[PDB]
Amino acid sequence: KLQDSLDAGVGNLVDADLAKESAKLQSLQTKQQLGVQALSIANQSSSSILSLF
Amino acid sequence: KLQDSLDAGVGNLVDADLAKESAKLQSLQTKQQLGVQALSIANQSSSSILSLF
């Protein structure tokens, strides 16, 4: 019983809960796709100079 | 981040505003054509004396 309680305490000490991570993964994947879109929009800005000439 | 800030500072230090140059260039082209035509009209001062003789 002592070894059981000790392993349970180590598991509380270290193990992460995954139900939070199913949310965190979705949020960061969506934010990454928005970041690539924002980076494309930022890269495109230089094209306007050519219209002036 | 610090190298990005230093590069942005150099860019503010030396970059030209091309939208200003788009106006300044056409203004100088028109002024140059006016200067050439003015020099052409000034060249003909010798023409008037032929009528006197």
PDB file of N, CA and C in Angstrom:
ATOM      1  N   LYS A   1       0.821  -1.211   0.000  1.00  0.00           N
ATOM      2  CA  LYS A   1       0.000   0.000   0.000  1.00  0.00           C
ATOM      3  C   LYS A   1       0.856   1.262   0.000  1.00  0.00           C
ATOM      4  N   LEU A   2       2.021   1.215   0.651  1.00  0.00           N
ATOM      5  CA  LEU A   2       2.904   2.376   0.674  1.00  0.00           C
ATOM      6  C   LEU A   2       3.474   2.663  -0.707  1.00  0.00           C
ATOM      7  N   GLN A   3       3.900   1.620  -1.426  1.00  0.00           N
ATOM      8  CA  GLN A   3       4.391   1.834  -2.783  1.00  0.00           C
ATOM      9  C   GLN A   3       3.280   2.351  -3.687  1.00  0.00           C
ATOM     10  N   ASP A   4       2.045   1.884  -3.464  1.00  0.00           N
ATOM     11  CA  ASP A   4       0.930   2.375  -4.270  1.00  0.00           C
ATOM     12  C   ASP A   4       0.694   3.862  -4.038  1.00  0.00           C
ATOM     13  N   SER A   5       0.617   4.275  -2.771  1.00  0.00           N
ATOM     14  CA  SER A   5       0.374   5.682  -2.473  1.00  0.00           C
ATOM     15  C   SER A   5       1.530   6.553  -2.945  1.00  0.00           C
ATOM     16  N   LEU A   6       2.751   6.019  -2.912  1.00  0.00           N
ATOM     17  CA  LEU A   6       3.895   6.811  -3.340  1.00  0.00           C
ATOM     18  C   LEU A   6       3.878   7.023  -4.851  1.00  0.00           C
ATOM     19  N   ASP A   7       3.551   5.975  -5.616  1.00  0.00           N
ATOM     20  CA  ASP A   7       3.434   6.146  -7.061  1.00  0.00           C
ATOM     21  C   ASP A   7       2.284   7.080  -7.412  1.00  0.00           C
ATOM     22  N   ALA A   8       1.197   7.033  -6.635  1.00  0.00           N
ATOM     23  CA  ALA A   8       0.107   7.974  -6.871  1.00  0.00           C
ATOM     24  C   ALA A   8       0.552   9.406  -6.605  1.00  0.00           C
ATOM     25  N   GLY A   9       1.401   9.603  -5.594  1.00  0.00           N
ATOM     26  CA  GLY A   9       1.880  10.944  -5.310  1.00  0.00           C
ATOM     27  C   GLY A   9       2.833  11.460  -6.369  1.00  0.00           C
ATOM     28  N   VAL A  10       3.677  10.580  -6.909  1.00  0.00           N
ATOM     29  CA  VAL A  10       4.544  10.992  -8.011  1.00  0.00           C
ATOM     30  C   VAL A  10       3.708  11.331  -9.239  1.00  0.00           C
ATOM     31  N   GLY A  11       2.623  10.581  -9.456  1.00  0.00           N
ATOM     32  CA  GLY A  11       1.778  10.851 -10.605  1.00  0.00           C
ATOM     33  C   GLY A  11       1.030  12.163 -10.487  1.00  0.00           C
ATOM     34  N   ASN A  12       0.588  12.505  -9.275  1.00  0.00           N
ATOM     35  CA  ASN A  12       0.059  13.847  -9.056  1.00  0.00           C
ATOM     36  C   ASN A  12       1.150  14.893  -9.230  1.00  0.00           C
ATOM     37  N   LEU A  13       2.391  14.540  -8.887  1.00  0.00           N
ATOM     38  CA  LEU A  13       3.484  15.501  -8.959  1.00  0.00           C
ATOM     39  C   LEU A  13       3.845  15.877 -10.391  1.00  0.00           C
ATOM     40  N   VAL A  14       3.747  14.943 -11.343  1.00  0.00           N
ATOM     41  CA  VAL A  14       4.346  15.138 -12.657  1.00  0.00           C
ATOM     42  C   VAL A  14       3.322  15.126 -13.788  1.00  0.00           C
ATOM     43  N   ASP A  15       2.347  14.219 -13.755  1.00  0.00           N
ATOM     44  CA  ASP A  15       1.506  14.002 -14.929  1.00  0.00           C
ATOM     45  C   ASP A  15       0.598  15.191 -15.224  1.00  0.00           C
ATOM     46  N   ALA A  16       0.507  15.537 -16.506  1.00  0.00           N
ATOM     47  CA  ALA A  16      -0.418  16.554 -16.984  1.00  0.00           C
ATOM     48  C   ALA A  16      -1.783  15.947 -17.285  1.00  0.00           C
ATOM     49  N   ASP A  17      -2.821  16.780 -17.194  1.00  0.00           N
ATOM     50  CA  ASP A  17      -4.157  16.391 -17.629  1.00  0.00           C
ATOM     51  C   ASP A  17      -4.375  16.778 -19.089  1.00  0.00           C
ATOM     52  N   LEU A  18      -4.992  15.874 -19.848  1.00  0.00           N
ATOM     53  CA  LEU A  18      -5.062  16.012 -21.296  1.00  0.00           C
ATOM     54  C   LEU A  18      -6.345  16.664 -21.792  1.00  0.00           C
ATOM     55  N   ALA A  19      -7.406  16.678 -20.984  1.00  0.00           N
ATOM     56  CA  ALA A  19      -8.641  17.313 -21.425  1.00  0.00           C
ATOM     57  C   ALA A  19      -8.454  18.810 -21.626  1.00  0.00           C
ATOM     58  N   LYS A  20      -7.578  19.436 -20.838  1.00  0.00           N
ATOM     59  CA  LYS A  20      -7.178  20.810 -21.121  1.00  0.00           C
ATOM     60  C   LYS A  20      -6.378  20.904 -22.413  1.00  0.00           C
ATOM     61  N   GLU A  21      -5.599  19.867 -22.720  1.00  0.00           N
ATOM     62  CA  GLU A  21      -4.700  19.946 -23.861  1.00  0.00           C
ATOM     63  C   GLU A  21      -5.436  19.748 -25.173  1.00  0.00           C
ATOM     64  N   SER A  22      -6.570  19.049 -25.148  1.00  0.00           N
ATOM     65  CA  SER A  22      -7.396  18.971 -26.346  1.00  0.00           C
ATOM     66  C   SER A  22      -7.932  20.343 -26.738  1.00  0.00           C
ATOM     67  N   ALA A  23      -8.146  21.226 -25.759  1.00  0.00           N
ATOM     68  CA  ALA A  23      -8.525  22.603 -26.059  1.00  0.00           C
ATOM     69  C   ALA A  23      -7.324  23.434 -26.485  1.00  0.00           C
ATOM     70  N   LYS A  24      -6.206  23.285 -25.770  1.00  0.00           N
ATOM     71  CA  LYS A  24      -5.034  24.093 -26.086  1.00  0.00           C
ATOM     72  C   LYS A  24      -4.509  23.800 -27.486  1.00  0.00           C
ATOM     73  N   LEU A  25      -4.593  22.543 -27.930  1.00  0.00           N
ATOM     74  CA  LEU A  25      -4.094  22.188 -29.253  1.00  0.00           C
ATOM     75  C   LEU A  25      -4.931  22.846 -30.342  1.00  0.00           C
ATOM     76  N   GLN A  26      -6.258  22.815 -30.186  1.00  0.00           N
ATOM     77  CA  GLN A  26      -7.136  23.451 -31.162  1.00  0.00           C
ATOM     78  C   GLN A  26      -6.896  24.952 -31.212  1.00  0.00           C
ATOM     79  N   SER A  27      -6.756  25.576 -30.038  1.00  0.00           N
ATOM     80  CA  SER A  27      -6.580  27.023 -30.009  1.00  0.00           C
ATOM     81  C   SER A  27      -5.269  27.430 -30.667  1.00  0.00           C
ATOM     82  N   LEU A  28      -4.176  26.730 -30.350  1.00  0.00           N
ATOM     83  CA  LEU A  28      -2.902  27.090 -30.960  1.00  0.00           C
ATOM     84  C   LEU A  28      -2.831  26.754 -32.444  1.00  0.00           C
ATOM     85  N   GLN A  29      -3.498  25.692 -32.908  1.00  0.00           N
ATOM     86  CA  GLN A  29      -3.503  25.440 -34.346  1.00  0.00           C
ATOM     87  C   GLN A  29      -4.261  26.532 -35.090  1.00  0.00           C
ATOM     88  N   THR A  30      -5.399  26.964 -34.540  1.00  0.00           N
ATOM     89  CA  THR A  30      -6.133  28.049 -35.180  1.00  0.00           C
ATOM     90  C   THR A  30      -5.322  29.340 -35.163  1.00  0.00           C
ATOM     91  N   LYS A  31      -4.658  29.625 -34.040  1.00  0.00           N
ATOM     92  CA  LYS A  31      -3.861  30.842 -33.955  1.00  0.00           C
ATOM     93  C   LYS A  31      -2.663  30.784 -34.894  1.00  0.00           C
ATOM     94  N   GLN A  32      -2.113  29.589 -35.127  1.00  0.00           N
ATOM     95  CA  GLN A  32      -1.022  29.444 -36.084  1.00  0.00           C
ATOM     96  C   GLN A  32      -1.490  29.709 -37.507  1.00  0.00           C
ATOM     97  N   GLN A  33      -2.675  29.210 -37.868  1.00  0.00           N
ATOM     98  CA  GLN A  33      -3.182  29.488 -39.211  1.00  0.00           C
ATOM     99  C   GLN A  33      -3.451  30.980 -39.401  1.00  0.00           C
ATOM    100  N   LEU A  34      -4.003  31.634 -38.373  1.00  0.00           N
ATOM    101  CA  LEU A  34      -4.170  33.084 -38.452  1.00  0.00           C
ATOM    102  C   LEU A  34      -2.832  33.808 -38.521  1.00  0.00           C
ATOM    103  N   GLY A  35      -1.795  33.269 -37.878  1.00  0.00           N
ATOM    104  CA  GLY A  35      -0.496  33.912 -37.945  1.00  0.00           C
ATOM    105  C   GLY A  35       0.141  33.801 -39.316  1.00  0.00           C
ATOM    106  N   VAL A  36      -0.041  32.660 -39.984  1.00  0.00           N
ATOM    107  CA  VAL A  36       0.451  32.547 -41.356  1.00  0.00           C
ATOM    108  C   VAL A  36      -0.317  33.485 -42.280  1.00  0.00           C
ATOM    109  N   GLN A  37      -1.627  33.633 -42.058  1.00  0.00           N
ATOM    110  CA  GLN A  37      -2.391  34.559 -42.893  1.00  0.00           C
ATOM    111  C   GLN A  37      -1.943  36.002 -42.676  1.00  0.00           C
ATOM    112  N   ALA A  38      -1.714  36.385 -41.418  1.00  0.00           N
ATOM    113  CA  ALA A  38      -1.243  37.734 -41.130  1.00  0.00           C
ATOM    114  C   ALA A  38       0.153  37.968 -41.691  1.00  0.00           C
ATOM    115  N   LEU A  39       1.011  36.943 -41.661  1.00  0.00           N
ATOM    116  CA  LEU A  39       2.341  37.084 -42.243  1.00  0.00           C
ATOM    117  C   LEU A  39       2.276  37.253 -43.754  1.00  0.00           C
ATOM    118  N   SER A  40       1.345  36.566 -44.417  1.00  0.00           N
ATOM    119  CA  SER A  40       1.189  36.759 -45.855  1.00  0.00           C
ATOM    120  C   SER A  40       0.715  38.174 -46.164  1.00  0.00           C
ATOM    121  N   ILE A  41      -0.249  38.669 -45.381  1.00  0.00           N
ATOM    122  CA  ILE A  41      -0.755  40.020 -45.616  1.00  0.00           C
ATOM    123  C   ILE A  41       0.339  41.050 -45.362  1.00  0.00           C
ATOM    124  N   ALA A  42       1.205  40.791 -44.379  1.00  0.00           N
ATOM    125  CA  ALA A  42       2.310  41.708 -44.119  1.00  0.00           C
ATOM    126  C   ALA A  42       3.348  41.661 -45.234  1.00  0.00           C
ATOM    127  N   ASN A  43       3.619  40.469 -45.774  1.00  0.00           N
ATOM    128  CA  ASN A  43       4.593  40.351 -46.853  1.00  0.00           C
ATOM    129  C   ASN A  43       4.109  41.035 -48.122  1.00  0.00           C
ATOM    130  N   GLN A  44       2.796  41.049 -48.352  1.00  0.00           N
ATOM    131  CA  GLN A  44       2.262  41.571 -49.607  1.00  0.00           C
ATOM    132  C   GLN A  44       2.330  43.098 -49.709  1.00  0.00           C
ATOM    133  N   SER A  45       2.619  43.808 -48.614  1.00  0.00           N
ATOM    134  CA  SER A  45       2.456  45.260 -48.576  1.00  0.00           C
ATOM    135  C   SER A  45       3.319  46.004 -49.591  1.00  0.00           C
ATOM    136  N   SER A  46       4.456  45.441 -50.002  1.00  0.00           N
ATOM    137  CA  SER A  46       5.396  46.160 -50.855  1.00  0.00           C
ATOM    138  C   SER A  46       4.898  46.365 -52.282  1.00  0.00           C
ATOM    139  N   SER A  47       3.875  45.628 -52.716  1.00  0.00           N
ATOM    140  CA  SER A  47       3.435  45.697 -54.107  1.00  0.00           C
ATOM    141  C   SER A  47       2.876  47.063 -54.490  1.00  0.00           C
ATOM    142  N   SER A  48       2.372  47.835 -53.525  1.00  0.00           N
ATOM    143  CA  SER A  48       1.730  49.108 -53.833  1.00  0.00           C
ATOM    144  C   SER A  48       2.693  50.138 -54.411  1.00  0.00           C
ATOM    145  N   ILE A  49       3.992  50.019 -54.125  1.00  0.00           N
ATOM    146  CA  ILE A  49       4.952  51.012 -54.596  1.00  0.00           C
ATOM    147  C   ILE A  49       5.027  51.031 -56.119  1.00  0.00           C
ATOM    148  N   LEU A  50       4.843  49.877 -56.764  1.00  0.00           N
ATOM    149  CA  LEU A  50       4.996  49.811 -58.213  1.00  0.00           C
ATOM    150  C   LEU A  50       3.927  50.615 -58.942  1.00  0.00           C
ATOM    151  N   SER A  51       2.740  50.760 -58.347  1.00  0.00           N
ATOM    152  CA  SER A  51       1.680  51.524 -58.996  1.00  0.00           C
ATOM    153  C   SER A  51       2.045  52.996 -59.134  1.00  0.00           C
ATOM    154  N   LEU A  52       2.858  53.521 -58.216  1.00  0.00           N
ATOM    155  CA  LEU A  52       3.257  54.922 -58.275  1.00  0.00           C
ATOM    156  C   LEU A  52       4.140  55.228 -59.477  1.00  0.00           C
ATOM    157  N   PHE A  53       4.840  54.231 -60.008  1.00  0.00           N
ATOM    158  CA  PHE A  53       5.788  54.448 -61.092  1.00  0.00           C
ATOM    159  C   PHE A  53       5.329  53.767 -62.375  1.00  0.00           C
TER     160      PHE A  53
ATOM    161  N   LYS B   1      14.973  39.387 -31.330  1.00  0.00           N
ATOM    162  CA  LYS B   1      14.186  40.619 -31.322  1.00  0.00           C
ATOM    163  C   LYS B   1      15.073  41.860 -31.359  1.00  0.00           C
ATOM    164  N   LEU B   2      16.238  41.805 -30.711  1.00  0.00           N
ATOM    165  CA  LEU B   2      17.115  42.970 -30.681  1.00  0.00           C
ATOM    166  C   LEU B   2      17.736  43.225 -32.049  1.00  0.00           C
ATOM    167  N   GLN B   3      18.136  42.161 -32.753  1.00  0.00           N
ATOM    168  CA  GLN B   3      18.654  42.353 -34.101  1.00  0.00           C
ATOM    169  C   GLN B   3      17.575  42.874 -35.041  1.00  0.00           C
ATOM    170  N   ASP B   4      16.325  42.428 -34.862  1.00  0.00           N
ATOM    171  CA  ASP B   4      15.249  42.986 -35.678  1.00  0.00           C
ATOM    172  C   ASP B   4      15.055  44.472 -35.394  1.00  0.00           C
ATOM    173  N   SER B   5      15.144  44.870 -34.121  1.00  0.00           N
ATOM    174  CA  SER B   5      14.991  46.285 -33.790  1.00  0.00           C
ATOM    175  C   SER B   5      16.137  47.116 -34.352  1.00  0.00           C
ATOM    176  N   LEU B   6      17.356  46.573 -34.333  1.00  0.00           N
ATOM    177  CA  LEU B   6      18.492  47.309 -34.878  1.00  0.00           C
ATOM    178  C   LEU B   6      18.371  47.473 -36.389  1.00  0.00           C
ATOM    179  N   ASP B   7      17.893  46.433 -37.080  1.00  0.00           N
ATOM    180  CA  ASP B   7      17.699  46.549 -38.523  1.00  0.00           C
ATOM    181  C   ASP B   7      16.592  47.541 -38.856  1.00  0.00           C
ATOM    182  N   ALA B   8      15.516  47.551 -38.063  1.00  0.00           N
ATOM    183  CA  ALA B   8      14.471  48.544 -38.280  1.00  0.00           C
ATOM    184  C   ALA B   8      14.983  49.955 -38.029  1.00  0.00           C
ATOM    185  N   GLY B   9      15.883  50.123 -37.059  1.00  0.00           N
ATOM    186  CA  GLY B   9      16.437  51.443 -36.814  1.00  0.00           C
ATOM    187  C   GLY B   9      17.341  51.912 -37.937  1.00  0.00           C
ATOM    188  N   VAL B  10      18.126  50.997 -38.512  1.00  0.00           N
ATOM    189  CA  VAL B  10      18.935  51.373 -39.672  1.00  0.00           C
ATOM    190  C   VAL B  10      18.032  51.730 -40.846  1.00  0.00           C
ATOM    191  N   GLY B  11      16.915  51.012 -40.988  1.00  0.00           N
ATOM    192  CA  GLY B  11      16.007  51.305 -42.083  1.00  0.00           C
ATOM    193  C   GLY B  11      15.344  52.660 -41.941  1.00  0.00           C
ATOM    194  N   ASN B  12      14.963  53.029 -40.716  1.00  0.00           N
ATOM    195  CA  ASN B  12      14.487  54.392 -40.504  1.00  0.00           C
ATOM    196  C   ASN B  12      15.598  55.404 -40.742  1.00  0.00           C
ATOM    197  N   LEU B  13      16.846  55.021 -40.465  1.00  0.00           N
ATOM    198  CA  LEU B  13      17.952  55.959 -40.614  1.00  0.00           C
ATOM    199  C   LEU B  13      18.251  56.293 -42.072  1.00  0.00           C
ATOM    200  N   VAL B  14      18.121  55.336 -42.991  1.00  0.00           N
ATOM    201  CA  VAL B  14      18.616  55.556 -44.347  1.00  0.00           C
ATOM    202  C   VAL B  14      17.566  55.385 -45.440  1.00  0.00           C
ATOM    203  N   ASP B  15      16.415  54.768 -45.183  1.00  0.00           N
ATOM    204  CA  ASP B  15      15.477  54.507 -46.272  1.00  0.00           C
ATOM    205  C   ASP B  15      14.843  55.795 -46.791  1.00  0.00           C
ATOM    206  N   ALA B  16      14.571  55.810 -48.094  1.00  0.00           N
ATOM    207  CA  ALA B  16      13.878  56.908 -48.752  1.00  0.00           C
ATOM    208  C   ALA B  16      12.390  56.603 -48.874  1.00  0.00           C
ATOM    209  N   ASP B  17      11.575  57.656 -48.854  1.00  0.00           N
ATOM    210  CA  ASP B  17      10.133  57.530 -49.040  1.00  0.00           C
ATOM    211  C   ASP B  17       9.832  57.629 -50.531  1.00  0.00           C
ATOM    212  N   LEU B  18       9.632  56.478 -51.174  1.00  0.00           N
ATOM    213  CA  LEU B  18       9.472  56.422 -52.622  1.00  0.00           C
ATOM    214  C   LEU B  18       8.215  57.125 -53.117  1.00  0.00           C
ATOM    215  N   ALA B  19       7.167  57.206 -52.296  1.00  0.00           N
ATOM    216  CA  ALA B  19       5.957  57.899 -52.727  1.00  0.00           C
ATOM    217  C   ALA B  19       6.207  59.387 -52.942  1.00  0.00           C
ATOM    218  N   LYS B  20       7.124  59.983 -52.175  1.00  0.00           N
ATOM    219  CA  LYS B  20       7.549  61.352 -52.441  1.00  0.00           C
ATOM    220  C   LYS B  20       8.313  61.446 -53.756  1.00  0.00           C
ATOM    221  N   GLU B  21       9.170  60.459 -54.023  1.00  0.00           N
ATOM    222  CA  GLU B  21       9.955  60.470 -55.248  1.00  0.00           C
ATOM    223  C   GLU B  21       9.081  60.297 -56.481  1.00  0.00           C
ATOM    224  N   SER B  22       7.951  59.600 -56.357  1.00  0.00           N
ATOM    225  CA  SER B  22       7.068  59.438 -57.509  1.00  0.00           C
ATOM    226  C   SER B  22       6.513  60.775 -57.985  1.00  0.00           C
ATOM    227  N   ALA B  23       6.283  61.714 -57.068  1.00  0.00           N
ATOM    228  CA  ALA B  23       5.869  63.054 -57.464  1.00  0.00           C
ATOM    229  C   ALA B  23       7.057  63.897 -57.901  1.00  0.00           C
ATOM    230  N   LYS B  24       8.162  63.803 -57.155  1.00  0.00           N
ATOM    231  CA  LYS B  24       9.301  64.675 -57.407  1.00  0.00           C
ATOM    232  C   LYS B  24       9.904  64.389 -58.779  1.00  0.00           C
ATOM    233  N   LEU B  25       9.850  63.127 -59.214  1.00  0.00           N
ATOM    234  CA  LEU B  25      10.440  62.735 -60.489  1.00  0.00           C
ATOM    235  C   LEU B  25       9.668  63.324 -61.661  1.00  0.00           C
ATOM    236  N   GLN B  26       8.340  63.180 -61.655  1.00  0.00           N
ATOM    237  CA  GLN B  26       7.540  63.766 -62.725  1.00  0.00           C
ATOM    238  C   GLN B  26       7.611  65.286 -62.713  1.00  0.00           C
ATOM    239  N   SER B  27       7.692  65.895 -61.525  1.00  0.00           N
ATOM    240  CA  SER B  27       7.844  67.344 -61.481  1.00  0.00           C
ATOM    241  C   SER B  27       9.151  67.776 -62.131  1.00  0.00           C
ATOM    242  N   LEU B  28      10.248  67.071 -61.839  1.00  0.00           N
ATOM    243  CA  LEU B  28      11.510  67.419 -62.482  1.00  0.00           C
ATOM    244  C   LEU B  28      11.524  67.112 -63.970  1.00  0.00           C
ATOM    245  N   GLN B  29      10.813  66.079 -64.418  1.00  0.00           N
ATOM    246  CA  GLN B  29      10.765  65.816 -65.854  1.00  0.00           C
ATOM    247  C   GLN B  29      10.054  66.945 -66.585  1.00  0.00           C
ATOM    248  N   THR B  30       8.935  67.415 -66.026  1.00  0.00           N
ATOM    249  CA  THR B  30       8.250  68.551 -66.631  1.00  0.00           C
ATOM    250  C   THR B  30       9.120  69.802 -66.579  1.00  0.00           C
ATOM    251  N   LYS B  31       9.793  70.037 -65.449  1.00  0.00           N
ATOM    252  CA  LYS B  31      10.625  71.229 -65.346  1.00  0.00           C
ATOM    253  C   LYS B  31      11.819  71.160 -66.290  1.00  0.00           C
ATOM    254  N   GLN B  32      12.339  69.958 -66.548  1.00  0.00           N
ATOM    255  CA  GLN B  32      13.434  69.804 -67.500  1.00  0.00           C
ATOM    256  C   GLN B  32      12.974  70.070 -68.923  1.00  0.00           C
ATOM    257  N   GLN B  33      11.777  69.601 -69.286  1.00  0.00           N
ATOM    258  CA  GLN B  33      11.275  69.917 -70.621  1.00  0.00           C
ATOM    259  C   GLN B  33      11.028  71.416 -70.779  1.00  0.00           C
ATOM    260  N   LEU B  34      10.538  72.071 -69.721  1.00  0.00           N
ATOM    261  CA  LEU B  34      10.417  73.527 -69.761  1.00  0.00           C
ATOM    262  C   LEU B  34      11.774  74.205 -69.884  1.00  0.00           C
ATOM    263  N   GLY B  35      12.799  73.661 -69.228  1.00  0.00           N
ATOM    264  CA  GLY B  35      14.116  74.270 -69.320  1.00  0.00           C
ATOM    265  C   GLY B  35      14.728  74.113 -70.699  1.00  0.00           C
ATOM    266  N   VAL B  36      14.500  72.962 -71.332  1.00  0.00           N
ATOM    267  CA  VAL B  36      14.999  72.751 -72.686  1.00  0.00           C
ATOM    268  C   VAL B  36      14.292  73.676 -73.668  1.00  0.00           C
ATOM    269  N   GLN B  37      12.966  73.795 -73.558  1.00  0.00           N
ATOM    270  CA  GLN B  37      12.264  74.696 -74.468  1.00  0.00           C
ATOM    271  C   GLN B  37      12.632  76.156 -74.213  1.00  0.00           C
ATOM    272  N   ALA B  38      12.898  76.522 -72.956  1.00  0.00           N
ATOM    273  CA  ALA B  38      13.317  77.888 -72.663  1.00  0.00           C
ATOM    274  C   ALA B  38      14.700  78.175 -73.230  1.00  0.00           C
ATOM    275  N   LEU B  39      15.621  77.212 -73.133  1.00  0.00           N
ATOM    276  CA  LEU B  39      16.929  77.395 -73.754  1.00  0.00           C
ATOM    277  C   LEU B  39      16.804  77.489 -75.266  1.00  0.00           C
ATOM    278  N   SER B  40      15.861  76.744 -75.845  1.00  0.00           N
ATOM    279  CA  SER B  40      15.660  76.808 -77.287  1.00  0.00           C
ATOM    280  C   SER B  40      15.166  78.185 -77.711  1.00  0.00           C
ATOM    281  N   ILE B  41      14.204  78.740 -76.969  1.00  0.00           N
ATOM    282  CA  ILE B  41      13.723  80.083 -77.289  1.00  0.00           C
ATOM    283  C   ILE B  41      14.804  81.132 -77.043  1.00  0.00           C
ATOM    284  N   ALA B  42      15.651  80.934 -76.032  1.00  0.00           N
ATOM    285  CA  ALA B  42      16.737  81.875 -75.782  1.00  0.00           C
ATOM    286  C   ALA B  42      17.824  81.802 -76.844  1.00  0.00           C
ATOM    287  N   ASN B  43      17.944  80.665 -77.532  1.00  0.00           N
ATOM    288  CA  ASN B  43      19.010  80.498 -78.515  1.00  0.00           C
ATOM    289  C   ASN B  43      18.842  81.428 -79.711  1.00  0.00           C
ATOM    290  N   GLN B  44      17.613  81.859 -79.996  1.00  0.00           N
ATOM    291  CA  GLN B  44      17.272  82.524 -81.246  1.00  0.00           C
ATOM    292  C   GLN B  44      17.422  84.041 -81.190  1.00  0.00           C
ATOM    293  N   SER B  45      18.140  84.574 -80.198  1.00  0.00           N
ATOM    294  CA  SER B  45      18.314  86.022 -80.119  1.00  0.00           C
ATOM    295  C   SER B  45      19.051  86.571 -81.334  1.00  0.00           C
ATOM    296  N   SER B  46      19.910  85.760 -81.953  1.00  0.00           N
ATOM    297  CA  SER B  46      20.649  86.195 -83.131  1.00  0.00           C
ATOM    298  C   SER B  46      19.767  86.340 -84.367  1.00  0.00           C
ATOM    299  N   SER B  47      18.585  85.720 -84.380  1.00  0.00           N
ATOM    300  CA  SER B  47      17.759  85.731 -85.585  1.00  0.00           C
ATOM    301  C   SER B  47      17.241  87.123 -85.925  1.00  0.00           C
ATOM    302  N   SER B  48      17.013  87.968 -84.916  1.00  0.00           N
ATOM    303  CA  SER B  48      16.368  89.256 -85.163  1.00  0.00           C
ATOM    304  C   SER B  48      17.234  90.198 -85.993  1.00  0.00           C
ATOM    305  N   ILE B  49      18.561  90.098 -85.877  1.00  0.00           N
ATOM    306  CA  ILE B  49      19.441  91.066 -86.523  1.00  0.00           C
ATOM    307  C   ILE B  49      19.445  90.916 -88.042  1.00  0.00           C
ATOM    308  N   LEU B  50      19.054  89.752 -88.566  1.00  0.00           N
ATOM    309  CA  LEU B  50      19.066  89.563 -90.015  1.00  0.00           C
ATOM    310  C   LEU B  50      18.080  90.498 -90.706  1.00  0.00           C
ATOM    311  N   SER B  51      16.962  90.807 -90.045  1.00  0.00           N
ATOM    312  CA  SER B  51      15.973  91.706 -90.625  1.00  0.00           C
ATOM    313  C   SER B  51      16.492  93.132 -90.763  1.00  0.00           C
ATOM    314  N   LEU B  52      17.419  93.549 -89.897  1.00  0.00           N
ATOM    315  CA  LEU B  52      17.921  94.919 -89.926  1.00  0.00           C
ATOM    316  C   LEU B  52      18.723  95.230 -91.183  1.00  0.00           C
ATOM    317  N   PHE B  53      19.314  94.226 -91.819  1.00  0.00           N
ATOM    318  CA  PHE B  53      20.136  94.460 -93.001  1.00  0.00           C
ATOM    319  C   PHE B  53      19.517  93.807 -94.231  1.00  0.00           C
TER     320      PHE B  53
END
